[PDB]
């Protein structure tokens, strides 16, 4: 009955019946990375001018990133450490039209790099949800007021430089 | 769901890139390694293999060992 | 043995079974596959022991589930203080705050 | 439904924060610890482990011990 | 679903014309033998029998032998 | 044996069972069907001593 | 309860009574010593005695 079919689901991911390529694998693994964020998000970004690409050229000699300022190359990643630009693989150029350039990789086998794409996606759609009339939403500002007292959420979400500016004012309303 | 090639109760992407077990109020919760929350309490960063039900081939799971549900 | 008259009898171990409640018909049935040797090495590693001889000057041994700070399953048990451990194991009290 | 991880028959929001066992007409009830009622009845406030089936690691559960459904 | 006559977990397309086993990050992968890609990595090309669960008629399958899920 | 008094005791092998955690009621139950002679050769071929 | 009113034989019975320290045992009904003799030994009152 189900025992020989409890074995076939333990080998559901080993056996690849047709393989045929190495770079076609990264294309089909980048797409199902991108279609597990819901549909309402992906039209929010394109509304602001969002052009999402997949490239194979690494992001040093890409033509839409050959020219930028010396601080635009230096923004902090999901951790907080600003990374050398030769080793980055996801970037958003947003000076007049936000373009999200994603270098393709094996993205289901890897889960550290799959999180540095979702962080950069929500970086672009942040300024829409964070503000209503070019002012901070009290729907959100009451959350930062509640999350600043708990000793776990304060060093989970907030940065280290933010931890020495919020309680320095000790009530930065 | 989450993928689990060895059926020990811990996902594949946690056995490869680090995990730890932390108690929150009175309940254990297995979680991926976060260097800002988990270094503060002295917790250990575990790594094991995503395709062995027991990494050192002894009859105790990777999940039974790190949680404490084991022969004491 | 006829000279010195010295012969003792040690007790190396004890085999014996465990009887557990049946929720079906409310009975109690001895499970002959489970012995007490699977249980006593788990009580002895997760509990504190207190020996007390205030009843007819004989030693009464009791064990109380206390918390081990280096085992994540064991840090779920409630906090045990030395006053409360005496008040539930042997039957102390405090009729005038002492 | 109510979360009962340790499978012993008593919810985990009751084991962490206190419970008691008291009969009213001829039936057994297992109520959470209300301070203004259960203290005057001469009852006992229990606490136990919400992730162990038996807090003392002995073969009687935390539900069987407090209810009398035990080897007498 | 892809045919597998002998129930040894590996399809009859692969067992006749070639396959090979390689790990990618920490997970094994069974793949058909593509000549230009796989030969420069020094992998071995296996052929077996699609009708027999074990081609040598010993009690270990062809899938267990090439993967390592076998008595060590 | 009375002259040289040389007698010793080798230990060729050891039988013994394994006790596993039971996820239903938390108990630990010795399975009398499997011994450590199945497990111990698997450890000496994958581990460094 | 032991009883020997039948040619001096210690006839023994056991009648289920309420332990007040066990919440399963307090569900048993209230038993009186008049009723307990009336159901286990054939005592009776025909006119109040
Ligand atoms: Ca796993
Ligand atoms: Ca594992
Ligand atoms: Ca429970
Ligand atoms: Ca419990
Ligand atoms: Ca086959
Ligand atoms: Ca075959």
Curated annotation (Swiss-Prot), chain A:
The protein's role, per its UniProt record: Edema factor (EF), which constitutes one of the three proteins composing the anthrax toxin, causes edema in the host. Acts as a calmodulin-dependent adenylyl cyclase by converting ATP to cAMP, leading to dramatic elevation of intracellular cAMP levels in the host, thereby causing edema. EF is not toxic by itself and only acts as an edema factor when associated with protective antigen (PA) to form the edema toxin (EdTx). Required for the survival of germinated spores within macrophages at the early stages of infection.
Domain statement: The N-terminal region contains the ATLF domain responsible for binding to the cleaved form of protective antigen (PA-63). The C-terminal region contains the calmodulin-dependent activation domain and the catalytic site. This region is composed of three globular domains: CA, CB and a helical domain connected to CA by a linker. The active site lies at the interface of CA and CB. The metal ion is coordinated by residues from CA; calmodulin probably binds in a multistep fashion first to residues in CA and then to residues present in the linker and the helical domain.
Range of the intact protein held here: 53 to 225 of 800
Compartments where found: Secreted; Host cytoplasm, Host cytosol
Family from the record: Belongs to the adenylyl cyclase class-2 family.
Name of this chain's protein: Calmodulin-sensitive adenylate cyclase
Subunit structure as annotated in this protein's UniProt entry: Interacts (via ATLF domain) with the cleaved form of protective antigen (PA-63) anthrax toxin; interaction is required for EF translocation into the host cytoplasm.
Gene that produces this protein: cya
Outcome following mutation: residue 123 to A: Loss of cytotoxicity due to inability to bind PA
Outcome (variant: residue 118 to A): Loss of cytotoxicity due to inability to bind PA
Domain named ATLF-like: residues: 8-173
Species this protein is from: Bacillus anthracis
Highest taxon of the lineage: Bacteria
From Swiss-Prot, chain C:
Membrane topology reported for the UniProt record: Multi-pass membrane protein
Site features described as Alpha-clamp, chain residue numbers: 23
Subcellular location: Host cell membrane; Host endosome membrane
Domain statement: To pass through this hydrophobic restriction, substrate proteins LF and EF need to be unfolded prior to translocation.
Summary of subunit composition and partner proteins: Homooligomer; homooligomerizes to form homoheptamers (PA-63(7)) or homooctamers (PA-63(8)). PA-63(7) or PA-63(8) form ring-shaped oligomers that are in a pre-pore conformation, which do not penetrate the host membrane. PA-63(8) displays an enhanced stability, suggesting that this form circulates in the blood to reach and exert toxicity even in distant tissues. Interacts with lethal factor (LF) and edema factor (EF); can bind LF and EF simultaneously and interaction takes place following homooligomerization on the host cell membrane.
UniProt function note: Mature form that oligomerizes and forms a pore to translocate the enzymatic toxin components edema factor (EF) and lethal factor (LF) into the host cytosol. Following attachment to host cell receptors and cleavage by FURIN, homooligomerizes to form ring-shaped oligomers that are in a pre-pore conformation, and associates with EF and LF. Toxin-leaded complexes are then endocytosed in a clathrin-dependent process, followed by a conformational change of oligomerized PA-63 from the pre-pore to pore state, which is triggered by the low pH in the endosome.
Identification of the protein by name: Protective antigen PA-63
Organism: Bacillus anthracis
Part of the intact protein present: 471 to 568 of 764
UniProtKB/Swiss-Prot annotation, chain F:
Cellular compartment(s): Host cell membrane; Host endosome membrane
Membrane topology, record value: Multi-pass membrane protein
Site (Alpha-clamp): 23
Superkingdom classification of source: Bacteria
Whole-protein coverage range: 471 to 519 of 764
Subunit structure: Homooligomer; homooligomerizes to form homoheptamers (PA-63(7)) or homooctamers (PA-63(8)). PA-63(7) or PA-63(8) form ring-shaped oligomers that are in a pre-pore conformation, which do not penetrate the host membrane. PA-63(8) displays an enhanced stability, suggesting that this form circulates in the blood to reach and exert toxicity even in distant tissues. Interacts with lethal factor (LF) and edema factor (EF); can bind LF and EF simultaneously and interaction takes place following homooligomerization on the host cell membrane.
Summary of the function given for this chain in its UniProt record: Mature form that oligomerizes and forms a pore to translocate the enzymatic toxin components edema factor (EF) and lethal factor (LF) into the host cytosol. Following attachment to host cell receptors and cleavage by FURIN, homooligomerizes to form ring-shaped oligomers that are in a pre-pore conformation, and associates with EF and LF. Toxin-leaded complexes are then endocytosed in a clathrin-dependent process, followed by a conformational change of oligomerized PA-63 from the pre-pore to pore state, which is triggered by the low pH in the endosome.
Annotated domain remarks: To pass through this hydrophobic restriction, substrate proteins LF and EF need to be unfolded prior to translocation.
Name of the protein described by the UniProt record: Protective antigen PA-63
